[model samples]
Structure formats: structure tokens, C-alpha cells
Target: SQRPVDRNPPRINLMPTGANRVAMRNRGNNEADAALQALAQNGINMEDLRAALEAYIVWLRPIPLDIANALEGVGITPRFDNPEEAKVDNPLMNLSSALKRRLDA
Candidate 1:
């Protein structure tokens, strides 16, 4: 079963124009935004990108356990880390192929 999409979108922090750690960190937002725009060009709606980006961010690599649990509760057992190796799975491990592909672009 699909999990209910999160309506309250997560904040996409834009990278500030400067050279600083926070700004550098926020650069990821620019990357993400560009990625979402790619999807938009592919005929995917901004809302779809928004939802996908939110899930992708939360489930990208260092997957958060609570978020993983929420995903699991909805029957999406993401591949990357086995629950056996990690009692509390990380959601970041479950970024959808769309976002991953966009990141590579």
C-alpha cells in the first residue's frame, strides 16, 4: 500500500550566494531544485517533484529510522540497508530512482 503523501512540504533551503559552510550546505537545495525542474520538464508536475523530493531527502542515504518506520508501515521496504544490519533503518537509503537520476544529470 502506498503511504499517504506528506502535505506539509519540507523546507528546501536555497543555497545562499556566498562561501560559507551553511551556504555550502544549502547548495544541496539548488541541486535539488535543478533536479526537480528536470522532472518538471519531463512532464512531472511540481507537486510530484515536491513530494518526491521530500521523500528523497528524508530517505536519501542516511535514512532516518522514524521515517523508515513510517515508510515500512506503508509497506515500502526500501532496498539499500537490510533491517538485519540496522534495527532502525535509514530512510535516506530509499531515494526514488527519479531523484537519483536527476542528481546524476
Candidate 2:
């Protein structure tokens, strides 16, 4: 299932200026305003909303995708000597066409 899009869109300004700073501040306010509106619609109060945000921040990943490349840095090369020796079911195995392309490139 697709997630619902935010009512207040994210704004980014590549240019550096006082106007850009104000725009960035406004963007944050817009997002917060939208969130509060949503909360109010669902009968959520300030304490409930604050608690939810706190919980989400606390539960955030300390190491995002810690094992995203567990084998890439390791000196151990993937075995392609024989299909019989290297099975997909092996836990030690890290096999993918994308990895091969990335390594080759």
C-alpha cells in the first residue's frame, strides 16, 4: 500500500540568502502546522502529539543500514569457481548481479 503524501511540501533553496533562510523557517512552520492540523482532526492533544514525536525520535535507527555493505569492505572474494560450492542458501554468501556490476565499474 502507498503511504499518504504530506500536505506541506518540502522546500529547498540552492541559493544562499536571508530570503532563503526565511523560506526554510517558513517551510518548517508549514510542516508543523500541517501535523498539528492532522493531530487535531484525529482528536489528539498537545501532550499526545509531543509523546508520539518523542517516541519516534527515540526509536530512530542509531546506525541506519549498518549491514548495507557487510562484505564489500571485507577482503574475502565471492567464490565463482563452481556453482556446487557456492549455494544461494549459504549464509556466508553475498551474491547479486548489481554487486558484480558495481565492483566491475
Candidate 3:
């Protein structure tokens, strides 16, 4: 005989504090709690999440700048690659970092 397990597993509901997720200065309570509860149910560790986020930030630290702009402004050498297709370990960090830095600004 086997014991019953909950198939309706808990899930973390991520919430954005601002009109856009990028605008959040702080990760708010409801979302944080949901994440904590969901992770606990799945036997996931919080430390793992922290390390993952850090690793992603470092990976996306921009290996290149706009070549044309660099040439016109500084007469520096220019090179180009498929930046959009460039793969990194962490996609969330790539998206978050670019938005957080306001790359256009």
C-alpha cells in the first residue's frame, strides 16, 4: 500500500512591485513568501538561487560595445558578432541586467 501525495503542488507566484518588473527596487513580500514556500515543497535551497543570480550578473557584464559608435566617437577599432544569439548560462540575468542598467540611458 502507498501513501497519497499532493499532486497540486505549491507554486511560487512572482509579483512585480512596479508597473514593470524592472522598476522594482525591492522584491516584495507576497512573491518572496510564495517562492520560499514553493521551494520548500520542492526541496530546493535558497542559497542555490542566490548563487545563480550572482553568476548570471557576472556572465553578462558586456564583452563588447556598439562598434559604429565607438569608431565615430573615439576612432577605436570595431568588431561585430551575433549578440542576440549569444548564449549565456543565465537568461534571466541577461534580461534583468540589461533592463536594470537602462542600457539606452
Candidate 4:
């Protein structure tokens, strides 16, 4: 929520398009199929990010004990919470709204 006021923001129909339409543009495939495929890909990639984070913990294990203690002193420590339990809600589940926009015009 702490955004810097660098300059005048672009006058675009946002509150929706700013995220979904621009993201859809990046997909290089428009329509329901594009949204569906993107959601599927992200569902897989959510775990991909988890895999890397877990590997991050594993890699830190080999660091010297002093280094670990130093990091702990700085209030940084390894997480013991279950990362696997985290959930991702696919935004495309609400595609009905976007589809309705098309029918409007």
C-alpha cells in the first residue's frame, strides 16, 4: 500500500484491466482458453516457487554455524511452518465478469 507518488498515473480503465487485461496481453493468447491455460500453468508454477524456497533452506544448511548465529542475531531465521499448506486462489475463477464485458459491447 506504500506506493511512491512519482508522477501522474496513467489514465486507463483500471480497477480490473490494469491487472487482468495487461496480464492477458502478456499471455499472447486471448479469450477463455488463454485464461484457463494460464491458470493451469500458474497452478503448477506455485509449487515451482515452493520447490525453490525449500531448496533455499537446504542450501543454507551448509553455512558455518557462526554465520547462522549471526543471521539469527539479525532476527532472520529459518521458517518451520508448513509452506506446503499455503493456497493459491486462481483469479480466472471469476472469468464470468470478463466474459460479460465482451457481451456488453
Per-prediction TM-score: 0.28, 0.27, 0.27, 0.21
Model 1, range 8-59, lDDT digits (tens) per residue? 8798977567564443231234433444444456555544444543554454
**How does model 3 score by TM-score?**
0.27
The lDDT ranking, best first, is 1, 3, 4, 2
Query: Global lDDT for candidate 3?
Result: 0.36
lDDT of 1: 0.44
TM-score of 4: 0.21
**Alpha-carbon RMSD, each predicted model:** 16.4, 21.9, 15.7, 17.7
Q: Put the candidates in TM-score order, highest first.
A: 1, 2, 3, 4
- Candidate 1's TM-score reads 0.28
Tens digits of per-residue lDDT for model 3, 22-80: 44222433333333334435554444432343343444433223322322232211221
Name the regions of candidate 1 deviating beyond 4 angstroms: 1-27, 53-105
Quick one: how many clashes does candidate 2 have? 0
Q: Tell me the deviation in Å of residue 4 in model 2.
A: 52
- Model 2: residue 76 alpha-carbon error in angstroms: 42
Cα deviation at 42, candidate 4, in Å, is 40
Candidates' C-alpha lDDT: 0.44, 0.35, 0.36, 0.36
* Candidate 4 residue-wise lDDT, 1-105, digit = tens: 775877877988745446655654522124433443443354423323223333434442232344334323323232324333311121221232333344456
Segments in model 2 whose C-alpha atoms lie over 4 Å from true places: 1-26, 59-105
Residue pairs with colliding backbones in model 4 are none
Q: Residue 9: error of model 2 in Å?
A: 35
- Candidate 2 worst ten-residue window by lDDT: 61-70
Quote the positional error of residue 16 for candidate 2 in Å: 26
* Candidate No. with top lDDT: 1
